[PDB]
């Protein structure tokens, strides 16, 4: 029989608490919750819209609770965090060679942000100004 | 002892051992090959090489030029039939490595590029960035995974070989994780254990390069050849001894003393060349020996800078710039920052000569075979007669794949035609190993192995360095004899079985002492100066082809003495003078 | 020792959706959260731009129908995908995890589809 | 001068005697140049002869160094005492079984590496024909991903591997990706089954800490995502072959 006794350290459910790098990962996953919450909010707003002016007014009142406002303010902060982190990670999927050298990821990151900035302006213009 | 069956056993999984293993798998697809290594293959010391591997390739080159450089650089102690074989087989093997996936640096057209090493006139050194050994070894290791003929014994420390009636019959090894002994039976055995540079206090070598294989062979009456010729690399970091490649000076780096003076011009390597244009054979790209010796002269004049780790000169690379640095020298910059707190862009790197490569080794013929039938040796651990009295820069990596193949194929043939030996005699030999081990464990006397080690290293550094004298060589010979007595009074306090390195490091030291004595005795008897062996005493300061155009053979008898015989050097087409 | 003949995972399907979802919500979610979540209820918009009438006009328009569909659905497939792995990483054991979250996504997708073709 | 001393906490374990690992403490002299490797040697030489650990190169190129320093996976030869004057705790490489002191069972690592067939496949060329042609551009495709020293720090770093020991892991996937992107290789299909497995690339949730701790800047996280893209293509093609 062997004289070895391999000691296996257990991994707890609090593994992510220890190291700030793991904490920022968990916080990234965290952004999902408001995102889903927002998609839900929109379905309510969609069906309140089809049921007519009465239902829509009750939807708009809900949105100014204003506990909901603070939740949405948080939702916005989460969404912007998701954006910032998403653009840092997507570049890593591309293996693009330019002049005998693997490119990236800054040239891609900047582009994504430029599109976000334009989209925000185009949409805000279309939604409000008219 | 649990007993295993194999057609051939390979001791060591570096460049040479793997190439041998792969070759034997291809020479016989039905073979059962046992590849043994005290570390996982990729930790083997071949991984640390950054210069490159020699192979003729440019149109304007010839195998005669590579043959000539080797023989001349070996100061005519090379076996010329072996050198000829060697040069003619480098292109095949470097190309084959490429076919196995090795990422050799490329020209724009997509052919492999080459550059200059070992003082060569025509550049022929193939290079994988500045990680050539890393790439060669990982390529070789990873390639060997597809051959199920190769059963690896990873982290198994080989203790001794089994010999009977002038024929090798297997070996005994310890399973390092279990702590248990194992017999491996094989009618052919290839020693590929690397050199013995860890017998020196300061060196470029990995901790595992302890001379085990050379020691085991000594035990069975096989002589070690040309052991006095030890190679110092001229630019290593102080304290650690870590190699700063020749590439630094290839890319136009300079070497200066406390006065910022490029001293090399005064030692026959003049005149000074401009910062942009380094020229081969001149200044910082002069002859290795002349450069390592120049340091010594500068140390005598009090021109070396003083540091806590030791006296040094400065390797200045500021005038290179980023593009050149980070394209061809990035790893050097990490090494410098980490191990001596120096940024090469903003500062000069401290350096001094450092023990590097073991030219000597286990005596072999032109097929890598020893005087014991079926027992082969290959790579730095061997002496095939390629390197003579000084190895050529970048011929070591090529040797691994050129002769690794040969040994792999050759060993396959001996196995096939071996025939059975005496079963009882062999098992008796195995019992002999197990018993000799128990004697070492039950040994006592309260001597600390580490201190014997420390002192061995200091003795080799003082006695068998760049410049040698009969006073100090004798001092080292006597010092080793002392330490051999002390070794018998060492006590190994860790009696554990699970990865017990206390025992293993102590065994290594044992081999080292035996090899060290061969180095010192060989040097003392060689009354001439040739290649890496340089003496200052009257009538020994010059080459002597009348009396010393011959190899040193160091035997070690059962009485523990180190005796010397001499043998002749095979000439073909290039006599000396 | 290691499985020589492993089953291909169906993850690429969900990952693809997760990928489109994350990219959409990265670019377009912030402005939409700002509009619906903040500007609208606080009444920080000029004239009748976000009044019941103009929203309905947009919603009912074909582009709006497709836009509102993707705006709702794509983030769900990204978000529920992330929650599925938050459970695993927190070691919270969810029975039939695969089916629950992606089923919820399927369900909601359908409900949203009904919405954008009106009820 | 006088060398400053540092108290170092090494987590010992001897399976013959100990029921669980336990900390020990050693005062070690140091200066600005002193590495954790240096210190481990000093301890064995002078304080505890039974301290077992892996190492060889001394210059961060072999990869045998691997171990945890203050919950961060590092190489002992590239870890320096000057940076830990507030305390230093040294454990065996994380997410691998502890055999003895700082030596862990690396078997799963090696087996994962072997599984993905890390060698050129389906190239009939022989050496008498000379080397393949490969441009800098073509080499730039896989080159960074060929720099792996197999130290296993990325395995200690990955919590997914911690949570799932069957995950073939960052370095293993990276090597598969390295050959898959080599213009000389024609065995991509021979490696996908593993990559496409749930224990393949799809165990990765892109925590990204493997790239963080990688001493040779291989960026295995990037190799995995590229692997996920390639696995997805392979999934699509597989769906469209009614053959
Ligand atoms: C820093 C550095 C840079 C270099 N650069 C270059 C270069 O650019 N070009 C060049 O040509 N040469 C170079 N060299 C020289 C050359 O790389 C080496 O001489 C060569 O790689 C040694 O290979 P090997 O297979 O003979 O032995 P190694 O690569 O040392 O392998 C020996 C093997 O034997 C095993 N082993 C040893 N003892 C035992 C035992 N008792 N039981 C079981 N296994 C054992 C080890 O585990 C190991 O796997 C360099 C050397 C150094 C130190
Ligand atoms: C579209 C292309 C795309 C998705 C690019 C970004 C890649 C990213 C952000 C990956 C991060 C990522 C996360 C965060 C997962 O949880 C996860 C879980 C299971 C499989 C894969 C993944 C994964 O790739
Ligand atoms: S990837 Fe970086 S870290 Fe993971 S093994 Fe290869 S080198 Fe060590
Ligand atoms: S640490 Fe782990 S999960 Fe993915 S990106 Fe790196 S492997
Ligand atoms: S000892 Fe070789 S990697 Fe640290």
Burial level of D86, CB count in 10 A (0-12/13-18/19+)?
A: exposed
Judge contact between B61 and B122, C-beta under 8 A. yes
Of D103, D120, D127, the CB nearest to B92: D127
Looking at the fold, whether D8 and D116 belong to one and the same domain comes out as no
State the Cα–Cα distance between residues B67 and B54, nearest whole angstrom: 11
- Taking the centre of ligand 5 as the mean of its atom positions, its distance from the CA of residue D87, in whole angstroms, is 23
**Token pair in block for residue B234:** 């001229």
The residue whose CB lies within 8 Å of the most ligand 4 atoms, and thus the one to mutate among D168, D175, D208, D226, is: D208
Judge contact between D139 and D145, C-beta under 8 A. no
Judge contact between B170 and B425, C-beta under 8 A. no
Testing the interface with B: which of D46, D56, D77, D110 to mutate, by most B Cβ within 10 A?
Answer: D56
Crossing angle of the two packed helices B80-99 and B63-73, in degrees rounded to 10: 120
Residues of B in contact with A3 (CB under 8 A): 178-179, 497-498
User: Per DSSP, which regions of B289-411 are E strands?
Assistant: 305-306, 311-316, 349-358, 361-363, 375-377, 382-383
- Residue of B124, B249, B328, B521 with catalytic role: B249
The CA distances from residue B353 to B51, B432, B533, in Å, are 17, 42, 15
Q: Is the CB of B357 inside a 6 Å radius of any atom of ligand 1?
A: yes
The verdict on a CB contact (< 8 Å) between D229 and A93 is yes
Q: Which of B49, B208, B242 is nearest to B139 (CA)?
A: B49
Residue A92 sits in a domain of what CATH number? 1.20.1300.10
Q: CB A84: neighbour CB atoms within 10 A? A: 14
Backbone angles phi, psi at D242, to 5 degrees: -75, -5
Q: Cβ of B497 under 8 Å from any chain A Cβ?
A: yes
Backbone angles phi, psi at B378, to 5 degrees: -155, 145
The CA distances from residue B203 to A48, B329, B530, in Å, are 80, 21, 22
Q: Which of A70, A38, A115 is nearest to C71 (CA)?
A: A38
Nearest atom (ligand 2) to Cα of C16: 1
Residues 6+ apart with CB under 8 A from D162: A11, A15, D94, D95
Crossing angle of the two packed helices D220-239 and D170-180, in degrees rounded to 10: 60
Burial A38-64 (b: 16+ CB within 10 A, else e): bbebbbebbbbbbeeeebbeebbeebe
Residues 6+ apart with CB under 8 A from A75: A34, A35, A37, A38, C33, C37
- Which one-letter DSSP state was computed for residue B554? E
β-pairing, B188-191 with B305-306? unpaired
State the Cα–Cα distance between residues B141 and B134, nearest whole angstrom: 10
Q: Subunits with at least 3 CB pairs below 8 A relative to chain C?
A: A, D
Is residue B68 part of an annotated ligand binding site?
no
Nearest atom (ligand 2) to Cα of C23: 1
Looking at the fold, whether D31 and D77 belong to one and the same domain comes out as yes
Count of residues making up chain A: 130
Three-class SS string for B490-546? ECCCCCCCCCCHHHHHHHHHHHHHHHHHHHHHHHHHCCCCECCECECCCCCCCCCCC
The domain boundary residue, chosen from D74, D105, D136: D105
What domains are there in chain C, each with its CATH number? Answer: 1-119 (1.20.1300.10)
As a whole number of angstroms, the longest Cα–Cα distance in chain D is 79
Judge contact between B100 and B140, C-beta under 8 A. yes
- Structural domains of chain A, count: 1
**Closest ligand by atom to D198 CA:** 2
Judge contact between D161 and D129, C-beta under 8 A. no
The resolution, in Å, is: 3.0
Looking at the fold, whether D209 and D142 belong to one and the same domain comes out as yes
The residue whose CB lies within 8 Å of the most ligand 2 atoms, and thus the one to mutate among A32, A82, A90, is: A90
Chain D residue with Cα closest to C83: D205
Nearest atom (ligand 5) to Cα of D65: 4
Q: Can you give the residue range of the structural domain that contains D10? A: 2-105
State the Cα–Cα distance between residues B198 and B206, nearest whole angstrom: 8
Residues 6+ apart with CB under 8 A from D43: D8, D10, D26, D28, D51
Judge contact between D16 and A3, C-beta under 8 A. yes
The domain boundary residue, chosen from D105, D138, D159: D105
Q: How far is CA D27 from the centre of its chain?
A: 30
| Count of helices and strands (H, E) across chain A | 5, 0
Beta bridge partners of B5: B185
- Which one-letter DSSP state was computed for residue C72? H
Burial B129-156 (b: 16+ CB within 10 A, else e): bbbbbbbbbbbbbbbbbbbebbebbbbb
Of D72, D144, D225, the CB nearest to A102: D144
Q: Is B521 labeled as catalytic in the residue annotation?
A: no
Looking at the fold, whether D148 and D200 belong to one and the same domain comes out as yes
Looking at the fold, whether D130 and D206 belong to one and the same domain comes out as yes
Q: Can you give the residue range of the structural domain that contains A13? A: 1-130
- Which one-letter DSSP state was computed for residue C34? I
Q: Is the CB of B217 inside a 6 Å radius of any atom of ligand 1?
A: no
The verdict on a CB contact (< 8 Å) between A3 and B177 is no
Q: Which of D164, D63, D32 is nearest to D108 (CA)?
A: D164
Count of residues making up chain B: 577
Looking at the fold, whether D166 and D86 belong to one and the same domain comes out as no
Backbone angles phi, psi at D216, to 5 degrees: -105, 15
What is the dotted CATH code of the domain comprising B543-577?
4.10.80.40
Is residue C99 part of an annotated ligand binding site?
no
Q: Between 3.30.930.10, 3.40.640.10, 1.20.58.100, 3.30.365.10, what CATH number should domain B423-542 receive?
A: 1.20.58.100
What is the dotted CATH code of the domain comprising B1-236+353-422?
3.50.50.60
Residue D90 sits in a domain of what CATH number? 3.10.20.30
- Taking the centre of ligand 2 as the mean of its atom positions, its distance from the CA of residue D234, in whole angstroms, is 17
Terminal CA-CA length for chain D: 79
User: Per DSSP, which regions of B104-206 are E strands?
Assistant: 114-115, 125-126, 150-154, 156-164, 167-175, 180-185, 188-191
What CATH class is the domain B237-352? alpha beta
State the Cα–Cα distance between residues B253 and B273, nearest whole angstrom: 11
- Which one-letter DSSP state was computed for residue C1? -
Q: Calculate how close chain A gets to C68, using CA atoms only, in Å.
A: 8
Q: Calculate how close chain B gets to A107, using CA atoms only, in Å.
A: 21
Judge contact between A102 and A62, C-beta under 8 A. no
Q: Is B309 labeled as catalytic in the residue annotation?
A: no
Q: Are B and A neighbours with ≥3 CB pairs closer than 8 A?
A: yes
Q: How far is CA B572 from the centre of its chain?
A: 26
Tell me how many degrees the CA angle B123-B128-B132 measures, rounded to the nearest 5.
95
**Token pair in block for residue D224:** 């995995």
Looking at the fold, whether D94 and D21 belong to one and the same domain comes out as yes
Query: Strand order of the sheet with strand B125-126?
Result: B53-54, B125-126, B114-115
Helix (H, G, I), strand (E, B) or coil at B327: helix
| Count of helices and strands (H, E) across chain D | 9, 7
Domain locations in chain B as residue ranges: 1-236+353-422, 237-352, 423-542, 543-577
Looking at the fold, whether D165 and D217 belong to one and the same domain comes out as yes
Looking at the fold, whether D90 and D162 belong to one and the same domain comes out as no
Judge contact between B506 and B490, C-beta under 8 A. yes
Nearest atom (ligand 2) to Cα of A28: 14
The verdict on a CB contact (< 8 Å) between A47 and C115 is yes
State the Cα–Cα distance between residues B252 and B319, nearest whole angstrom: 8
Chain B residue with Cα closest to A2: B178
- Structural domains of chain D, count: 2
**Token pair in block for residue B400:** 């691994």
The CA distances from residue B528 to B182, B295, B479, C7, D207, in Å, are 46, 22, 23, 71, 64
Backbone angles phi, psi at D87, to 5 degrees: 130, 150
Looking at the fold, whether D131 and D69 belong to one and the same domain comes out as no
Residues 6+ apart with CB under 8 A from B346: B318
Judge contact between B147 and B20, C-beta under 8 A. no
Judge contact between B403 and B379, C-beta under 8 A. yes
Looking at the fold, whether D101 and D214 belong to one and the same domain comes out as no
Chain C residue with Cα closest to A47: C115
Q: Is the CB of B39 inside a 6 Å radius of any atom of ligand 1?
A: yes
């Amino acid at each position: 029989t062997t004289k070895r006794k391999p000691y296996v350290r257990p991994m707890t459910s609090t593994w992510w608490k220890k190291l700030p790098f793991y904490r920022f990962y968990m916080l990234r996953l965290g952004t999902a919750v408001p995102a889903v919450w927002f998609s839900i909010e929109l379905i309510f707003g969609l069906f309140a819209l089809k049921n007519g002016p009465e239902a829509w007014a009750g939807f708009v009142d809900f949105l100014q609770n204003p506990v909901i406002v603070i939740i949405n303010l948080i939702t916005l902060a989460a969404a912007l965090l998701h954006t910032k982190t998403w653009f840092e990670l997507a570049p890593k999927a591309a293996n693009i060679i330019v002049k005998d050298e693997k490119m990236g990821p800054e040239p891609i990151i900047k582009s994504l942000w430029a599109v976000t900035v334009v989209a925000t302006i185009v949409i805000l213009f279309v939604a409000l100004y008219w | 002892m649990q007993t295993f069956q194999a057609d051939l056993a390979i001791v060591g999984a570096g460049g040479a051992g793997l190439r041998a293993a792969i070759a034997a798998a291809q020479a016989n697809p039905n073979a059962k090959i046992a590849l043994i290594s005290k570390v996982y293959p990729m930790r083997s010391h071949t991984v640390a090489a950054e210069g490159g591997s020699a192979a003729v390739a440019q149109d304007h080159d010839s195998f005669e030029y590579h043959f000539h450089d080797t023989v001349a650089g070996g100061d005519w102690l090379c076996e010329q039939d072996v050198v000829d074989y060697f040069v003619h087989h480098c292109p095949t093997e470097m190309t084959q490595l490429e076919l196995w996936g090795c990422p050799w640096s490329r020209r724009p057209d997509g052919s492999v590029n080459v550059r200059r090493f070992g003082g060569m006139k025509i550049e022929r050194t193939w290079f994988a960035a500045d990680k050539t050994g890393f790439h060669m070894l990982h390529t070789l290791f990873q390639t060997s995974l597809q051959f199920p003929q190769i059963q690896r014994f990873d982290e198994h420390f080989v203790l001794d070989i089994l010999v009977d009636d002038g024929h090798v019959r297997g070996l005994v090894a310890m399973n390092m994780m279990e702590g248990t002994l194992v017999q491996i039976r094989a009618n052919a055995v290839v020693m590929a254990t690397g050199g013995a540079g860890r017998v020196y206090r300061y060196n470029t070598n990995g901790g595992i390069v302890t001379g085990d294989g050379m020691g085991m062979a000594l035990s069975h009456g096989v002589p070690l050849r040309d052991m006095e010729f030890v190679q110092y690399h001229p630019t290593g970091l102080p304290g650690s001894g870590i190699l700063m490649t020749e590439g630094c000076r290839g890319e136009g780096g300079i070497l200066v003393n406390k006065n910022g003076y490029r001293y090399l011009q005064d030692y026959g390597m003049g005149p000074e060349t401009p910062l942009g244009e380094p020229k081969n054979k001149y200044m910082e790209l002069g002859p290795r020996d002349k450069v390592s010796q120049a340091f010594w002269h500068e140390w005598r004049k009090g021109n070396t800078i003083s540091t806590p780790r030791g006296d040094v000169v400065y390797l200045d690379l500021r005038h290179l710039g980023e593009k050149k640095l980070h394209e061809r020298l990035p790893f050097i910059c990490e090494l410098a920052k980490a191990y001596v707190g120096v940024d090469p862009v903003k500062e000069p790197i401290p350096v001094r000569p450092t023990a590097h490569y073991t030219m000597g080794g286990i005596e072999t013929d032109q097929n890598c075979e020893t005087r014991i039938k079926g027992l082969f040796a290959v790579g730095e651990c061997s002496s095939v007669g390629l390197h003579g009295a000084n190895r050529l820069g970048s011929n070591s990596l090529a040797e691994l794949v050129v002769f690794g193949r040969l040994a792999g194929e050759q060993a396959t043939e001996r196995a096939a035609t071996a025939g059975n030996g005496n079963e009882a005699a062999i098992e008796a030999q195995a019992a002999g190993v197990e018993q000799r081990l128990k004697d070492l464990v039950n040994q006592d006397g309260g001597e600390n192995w580490a201190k014997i080690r420390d002192e061995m290293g200091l003795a080799m550094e003082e006695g068998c360095g760049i410049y040698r004298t009969p006073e100090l060589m004798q001092k080292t010979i006597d010092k080793l004899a002392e330490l051999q007595e002390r070794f018998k009074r060492v006590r190994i306090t860790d009696t554990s079985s699970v990865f017990n390195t206390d025992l293993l490091y102590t065994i290594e030291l044992g081999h080292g002492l035996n090899v060290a004595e061969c180095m010192a005795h060989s040097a003392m008897a060689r009354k001439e100066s040739r290649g890496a062996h340089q003496r200052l005493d009257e009538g020994c300061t010059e080459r002597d082809d009348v009396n010393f155009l011959k190899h040193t053979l160091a035997f070690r008898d059962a009485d523990g003495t180190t005796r010397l015989e001499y043998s002749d050097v095979k000439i073909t087409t290039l006599p000396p003078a | 020792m290691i499985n020589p003949n492993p089953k291909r995972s169906d993850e690429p399907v969900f990952w693809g959706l997760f990928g489109a979802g994350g990219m959409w919500s990265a670019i377009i979610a912030p402005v939409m959260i700002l509009l619906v979540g903040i500007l609208l209820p606080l009444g920080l918009f000029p004239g009748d731009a976000l009044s019941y009438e103009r929203v309905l006009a947009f919603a009912q328009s074909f582009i709006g129908r497709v836009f509102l569909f993707l705006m709702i659905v794509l983030p769900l497939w990204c978000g529920l995908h992330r929650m599925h792995h938050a459970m695993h990483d927190l070691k919270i054991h969810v029975p039939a995890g695969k089916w629950v979250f992606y089923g919820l996504a399927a369900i909601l997708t359908v409900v949203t589809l009904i919405g954008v073709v009106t009820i | 001068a006088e060398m400053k001393n540092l108290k170092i906490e090494v987590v010992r374990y001897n399976p013959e005697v100990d029921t669980a690992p336990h900390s020990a403490f050693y005062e070690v002299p140091y200066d600005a140049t002193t590495s954790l490797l240096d210190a481990l040697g000093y301890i064995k030489d002078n304080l505890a002869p039974d301290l077992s650990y892996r190492w060889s190169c001394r210059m961060a190129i072999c990869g045998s160094c691997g171990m945890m320093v203050n919950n961060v996976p590092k190489l002992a030869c590239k870890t320096f005492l000057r940076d830990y004057t507030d305390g230093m705790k040294v454990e065996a490489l994380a997410n691998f079984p502890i055999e003895r002191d700082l030596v862990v069972d690396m078997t799963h690592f090696i087996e994962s590496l072997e599984a993905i067939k890390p060698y050129i496949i389906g190239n009939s060329r022989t050496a008498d024909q000379g080397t393949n042609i490969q441009t800098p551009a073509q080499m730039a495709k896989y080159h960074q991903f060929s720099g792996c020293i197999n130290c296993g720090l990325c395995y200690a770093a990955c919590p997914q591997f911690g949570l799932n020991p069957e995950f073939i892991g960052p370095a293993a996937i990276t090597l598969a990706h390295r050959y898959n992107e080599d213009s000389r290789d024609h065995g991509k299909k021979e490696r996908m089954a593993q990559l496409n497995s749930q224990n393949g690339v799809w165990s990765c949730t892109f925590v990204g800490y493997c790239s963080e701790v990688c001493p040779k800047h291989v960026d295995p996280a990037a190799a995995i995502q590229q692997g996920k893209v390639e696995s997805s293509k392979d999934f699509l093609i597989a769906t469209l072959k009614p053959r």
